[PDB]
Amino acid sequence: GLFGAIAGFIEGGWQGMVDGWYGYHHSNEQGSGYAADKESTQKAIDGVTNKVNSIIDKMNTQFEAVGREFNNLERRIENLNKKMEDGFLDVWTYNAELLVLMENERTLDFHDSNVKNLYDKVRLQLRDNAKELGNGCFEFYHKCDNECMESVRNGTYD
Amino acid sequence: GLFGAIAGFIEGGWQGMVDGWYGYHHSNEQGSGYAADKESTQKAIDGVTNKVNSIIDKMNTQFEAVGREFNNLERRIENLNKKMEDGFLDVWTYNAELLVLMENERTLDFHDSNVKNLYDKVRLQLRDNAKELGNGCFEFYHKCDNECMESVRNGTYD
Amino acid sequence: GLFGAIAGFIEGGWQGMVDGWYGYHHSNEQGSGYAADKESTQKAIDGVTNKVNSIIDKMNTQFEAVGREFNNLERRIENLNKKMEDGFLDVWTYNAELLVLMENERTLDFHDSNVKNLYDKVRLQLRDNAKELGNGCFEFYHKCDNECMESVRNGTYD
Amino acid sequence: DQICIGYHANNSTEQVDTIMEKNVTVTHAQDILEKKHNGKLCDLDGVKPLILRDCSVAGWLLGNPMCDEFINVPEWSYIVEKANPVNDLCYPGDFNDYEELKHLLSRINHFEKIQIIPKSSWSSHEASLGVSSACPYQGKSSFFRNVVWLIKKNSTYPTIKRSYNNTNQEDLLVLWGIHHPNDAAEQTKLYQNPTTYISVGTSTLNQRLVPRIATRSKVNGQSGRMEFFWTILKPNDAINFESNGNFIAPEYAYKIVKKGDSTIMKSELEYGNCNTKCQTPMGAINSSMPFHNIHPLTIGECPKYVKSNRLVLATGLRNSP
Amino acid sequence: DQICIGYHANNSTEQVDTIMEKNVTVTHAQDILEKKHNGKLCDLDGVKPLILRDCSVAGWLLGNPMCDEFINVPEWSYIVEKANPVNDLCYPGDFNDYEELKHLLSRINHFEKIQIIPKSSWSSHEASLGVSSACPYQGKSSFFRNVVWLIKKNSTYPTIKRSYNNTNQEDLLVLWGIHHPNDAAEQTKLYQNPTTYISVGTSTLNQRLVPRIATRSKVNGQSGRMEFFWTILKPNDAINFESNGNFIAPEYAYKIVKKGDSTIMKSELEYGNCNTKCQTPMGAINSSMPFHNIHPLTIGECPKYVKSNRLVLATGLRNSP
Amino acid sequence: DQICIGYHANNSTEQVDTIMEKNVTVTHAQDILEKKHNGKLCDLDGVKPLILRDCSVAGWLLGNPMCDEFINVPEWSYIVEKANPVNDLCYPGDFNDYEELKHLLSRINHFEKIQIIPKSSWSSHEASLGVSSACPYQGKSSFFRNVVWLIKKNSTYPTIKRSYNNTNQEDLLVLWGIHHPNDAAEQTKLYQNPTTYISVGTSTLNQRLVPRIATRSKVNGQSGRMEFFWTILKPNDAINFESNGNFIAPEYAYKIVKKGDSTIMKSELEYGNCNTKCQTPMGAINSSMPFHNIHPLTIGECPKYVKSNRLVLATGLRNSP
C-alpha cells in the first residue's frame, strides 16, 4: 500500500490483537502481550462510518424507472423510452461501482496511513533510546518494565 | 490526515505566520519569528489554482433543460420529458457534489503532504546536528544565530 | 508529488537504468552501476496493468446512439431525442475524462510511493552504518565491496 | 525488551475490489447490495394489489362477461396484468387512446362504478338484444356489462338524444363505443338507417364518429368491430350524445374516487398471500440495504436499483495470511 | 536554540465537507454556487422580453380583441406567459397542433404582421357581421382581429375560391379556422348550405375540413366551436382556399422575420425594469460562479444549474482551534 | 562508497493531464482514444451495405422507375441514404407513417419481393394506362413499379373486391395508395364515379380512405397527389380491398425475409470497396482502442464513442529533464 506499513515493513497483522485495529505488542522480563491504541482506532472507526453514510446518501437520489406503454405504431417513442431508462440505469450502475472501487482503495490506504503515523509517533519518542529493528519493532537499550512500557503507549516516555 | 503532519505531530497552525501557507519558526539568543517558505507555498498555490479551474471547466459541459409543451392526451410523452430532464439534473448534481467532496479531501491531504515534505527536508539537513523534538521542532546542539538559521531555510546548512 | 521522493528529495531520474522502474546506483573502488529492484518494479507493473483494464472495462457499458426519424410535425419529440442522446454522450465524455484525470494523478503518486518505500527500506537496514546524504544516497562508514553492495540490494545487510 | 506497532488480523474471508487489485481479503466489509427477493406478489403496506390475472385493463373497465371477478373492486395499492391476458376485447376491435388511459390509471387507487344511463331507460330502442357469441357468459351470448349494444325496435331506429351531467364532486371516466359492421345489409339489419353517426360533446369534447364498413378477417368468430372511446367528465360538466345508429351507449361509468400513486406491473405471477414495503414484478424486497439488483420497476420504500452483481465496501483493513 | 516547521492558521470560519468528515474548518475556501437572484423579469442583453401577461400565445397570434397590447410587437429576447392566461380562445374551441407551434416560436425572435386577404375584398359574402359576445371589445361583440368570420349575403353563400402566393423572402405563418355550429338550423342561419367543406392546399398541404355538429356545454356563453389551423408557407409557394361555408378566413398573416434563440417561460411575474445577461422564470442572475441553483430553465450566459444547497471547495488547509 | 535509490528516466516526450497539472511528461503512457478512420463506406463483416445513393426508402419500396438498381436487392448489413435524395415520391404526395416504417426497416436485413395481385388480373379495369409524366422512365411516362394506377374501362369503374391471403411463413409488407385529384372533372375523367372510397381490412386493420379534392401547387409538374399506406400482414391473415375509384392497387409486396440488426445511416459518401468490423457514417474503424471520437452512430464491434479530443493514461512515471 501507499504508506508502506501494512504488509510492507510490517509483514503481517496480529490475530492476537482483538480489541482494536492498531496497537502495540510488548515483550520483556515480566512477559508479553497486545494493547490496542484506542485513540487511532476510534478516529479510524469514525472516518469509515462517516464514509459509508456519505456513500449511501450520495446515492439516495437516483433514477427511478417508470412503466410506460405504447401501441403498435409508436415504436420509435417506445424505443426512445427504453434507451432513456436503460441509459440512466447504466450511468448509475457505473457511478456506484466506481465509487465503491475508488473508495475501497482509499479505505485500505487510510488504515495504512494510520499504522504509519502511529509507528512514526513511537519512533519520535524513543529517539536514540532504542534500536529501530526495521519490522515495526524497537529494541530497548535499557531494561523496560511494564510501567516503562505503559509509558510508551500513552506518549509520556523519556 | 494521511501524511501525519497537519494536526498530527504538528499539533496546530500558526496565527503569526501571515505571508505563506508553510514555513519556519526560529528561536535563539537574538530573538524569534516566522519565515514563510516561498517555494512550497508557491507550488501549493499553483496546484490548488489549476485544480479549481480543472473542476470548473470539466463541469462547463452539462445538461440544459429546455421547455416543451404537451396537450391533454400526450401525458406519457410529457412524463417521459419530465423524467429525462430531472434524470440528467440528478446525474449532474451528483457528479458536482461528489467531485467537490473527493477533491476537498485531496486538497487537505495535499497541504498535509507539503508540510511533511518540508519537515523531512529540514530533518535531512540537520542530521545528527540537532535533537528531533517530535513536535515539528529541532533543538540545536550548537548555538545557532540568525545567519545559521537563515542557512537552514535556504537548504545550505552544514 | 505526494510522497516527496520523485522530483522531490531525489532530484531526477536515471537515463542509465533501463531494466526497471526503480532500483539502485552503487559506487565503490571496484566501480559503479545500476541495478533494478525487480520486486517493486514487478508489483508496480501489476498495479498499473490491472488499473488500465479496470478503467477500460468499467467503460465498456456506455450509451449507444440510435438513429430515429421524425416528420415535420414531430419537432418536440425530435428535439427530445436529440437532447437525450447528446445528454448521455456528455455524461460519458465527462466520466471518461475525469476518470483519466484522477487516475493519472493516482498513478504518478503510486510510483512516488514505491520509490519512497524502497528508499525507507534501505534506510532501515543501513541504520547508523551509513550517512544519509539527503538526496537518495547513503555514504558508507566502512568500505563496501560488490558483495557488500549486493547484500544491501537483497535485504540481507548487517 | 521490545515494543512493536502492528495491526489487526482475523479469520475473515470477505473480499473487496479496488482499481489496482481484485479480491483483496479484508478483516471487515459491508455488503450494500440486496440480491434476494421472496418471489411472490404481496400486499403493499397492508393494501392488496388489484391482480387482474387473465383479464386486461380494457376487459376490466368495459366489463367483459368473463371479467366478473372485477365488477366491483376495493381500492388497490398497485395493479398487476399479464403480458398477454386472454380476456381482452372479447368482441374484436380497438380501444382508442388505450395507453394514455392506462397512464392515467397509474395515478389512481380507487374507482367507484355508478350507473349513468339505465338499460330500462331505453323506450324507442331494443336494449336486451345487443349481445354476441364472441362474448359468452355461462354458455350464452352476452356482452360488455358496462355498455349497451342498442338495436332497432319494430324496424325503426329514432335519433337518440341523451345527456348526463356529472353531479358528483369526483371526475368521471365515461366509456362508450361504435359498431363497425361487415356490409350494407348488416347496417340495415341492425340499425335500419343506411348512413349513421354518433356525436359526443362536453365542454371540451367535440366528436362525431361514422361507421367504417370493410371486409375483414374473423377474430373470435366475428368480422364486425367495436371501437371504444373514453373521456374524463369534469365536475359540473355534461356529456351529450346524439346518434341514429351503431351506438354502444354507456350504462355504467367509473367515479374517480382517489389519487394517487400506483403502477400496472407486468407479471405472470399470482397472489402470494404476503405483506411487503417494497414490491417488484418478480417478488418482494425486505432489506435495509441501500441498493438492490432485483428489477428496475418497484413501488414503495425501495433501495436504489443497480445492474451490479456485487457491491461490497471495505471497512477494515487488508487481512494477512 | 530551535527551528520549527509549521503551517498557517487564521480566524477563518469557513467550512468544507469531505467523504470522511463534514464541517472541516479551513483557512481559505471558494464558494462556486450562486444562490441569489434579484426576483424580477429583466431585459436580456438590452433586448426586452415579450411579456404577454394575461394573453396566451393563441390569444396573441389569432388577435383576441382583449389582446390589443400585442397587435404589433417589437422583436423580443424571450417570451413570458402565465400558467393559466385568462385571455385565450375567447370564443371556445381548439388550436390544432398548438404545442408544435409554440415549439416553433421558441426559435423565433421577430414576427411581422402583413395583410394577405383584406376584409374589403369580400364581394359575395358579408364580412362585417362575423362577431360574437364571447369575444367583446369595449362592451360590443367583436372577434379575433386576424381572421374573418364570413357570413352569407342575401341568403346565399357562393363557393369561395381564394389564393395567396408568398412573394416575400421570409416564411409566412398563415392561420385560418372552421366554425362548428350547434345544430342543422344554425348551419342554415349562418351559411345557407347544409353540408359544407373547407379545402386548403399548398405544395405540401392537402387538407379538407368538414364541420362537426354536436350538442355541447357552453364555454364563455357559447356552444359553438372554432377550430384553428396553421401552416408555414414557403417562399414562392401559394395557398389555395376553397369553401362553401364555416370558413374563418385569414385577414393577416405573420412574416417570419427572424430566427433564432428564444424561450416561452412560464411565470406569474411582471416586468421588472431591469437588465441582465442570464434570466430565469424566478428572476435574473448576475454572478461569476460556475454553478447556480435558482431554476433549471435559463436563457443567456448562464452558470450550470445544480440541485445543491451548497458547493464549497477547500483552497487552504485545515484551520486549527 | 555509496549506494543510492533512484528511478527510471528516458527520452519519452508523451504528456498526460492530471487535476493539479497539465502536460506532465511521463516515461510511458497509453493512448486509449481512436482518432482515425479511413473515410469510406465498407462492407460490414463481408456483408455489403444497401447503398441507395440518390433513391430514398420510399422511392425504393414503392418502386420508383428511376430506382431500378434496387428492383431486387441482396441482404444487406446496413442501409445508406443521403440527406436529400432526388429520387423520392416522383409523383408528389405523402407516405403515411413513413418514419415508423423506416424504424421497422432498421431491424430487417432481407426483403424478398413477391407478386400478390398481377397486372394481368384486372378484367373490368384498365391497368396499362395508370402512368404519369412526373415519373418518367427512358423518356416515357411511367409509374411506381410495385403498385397499379387503375383506371376506368369503357367509361365504367365497377366496385373492386380483392383479397390476398398470406400463405407465406414470413410477415408481409403490403403497400397501397390513394389518388387525390385536382377537381370534380378529373374524378369523372379517371374514375367515372363522383364519390369514392377504398376500404382495407385485415384481422387488425379497419380502414376507409376518401379522396380529398383540393387546389394546390404543382410539385414535379403535377397538382394531383398520391398518399401511400402500408401494413404488415401476419402469416395466415388475409387483406381485403374494396374500392370504386382512386385505388392504387398492390402488384408486389415484400416478404419479411429476416431480422435483425441494421441501420439507415445518413451519408453523402459512395461505396468504398473495403471491408470493416465497425462502420460510421464518416468512415470505417479498425482499432483495438476502447474509445473513439469519430461519430456517435456506429454498427458492429465498436469502441465506445466520446466527445474527447484526447484520452491518454499515464503508465510510467514523471519523466525528468
Author numbering:
A (entry chain F), B (entry chain F), C (entry chain F): 1 to 158
D (entry chain E), E (entry chain E), F (entry chain E): 5 to 325
Excerpt from the paper describing this PDB structure:
However, a prerequisite for efficient transmission of avian viruses between humans is a change from preferential recognition by the virus hemagglutinin (HA) of α2-3-sialyl-galactose-terminating host cell receptors, predominant in avian respiratory and gastrointestinal epithelia, to those terminating in α2-6-sialyl-galactose, which predominate in the human upper respiratory tract. Thus to better understand the nature and significance of such adaptive changes, it is essential to monitor HA changes that may affect receptor specificity of avian influenza viruses, particularly during human infection. A single amino acid difference was observed in the HA of each egg-grown virus: Asp186Glu in A/Vietnam/CL1/2004, Val134Ala in A/Vietnam/CL105/2005, and Phe151Leu in A/Vietnam/CL2009C/2005 (H5 numbering). The effects of the single amino acid substitutions in the HA on receptor binding were also studied by X-ray crystallography of HAs in complex with pentasaccharides possessing terminal sialic acid (Sia) linked to galactose (Gal) by either α2-3 (LSTa) or α2-6 (LSTc) linkage.
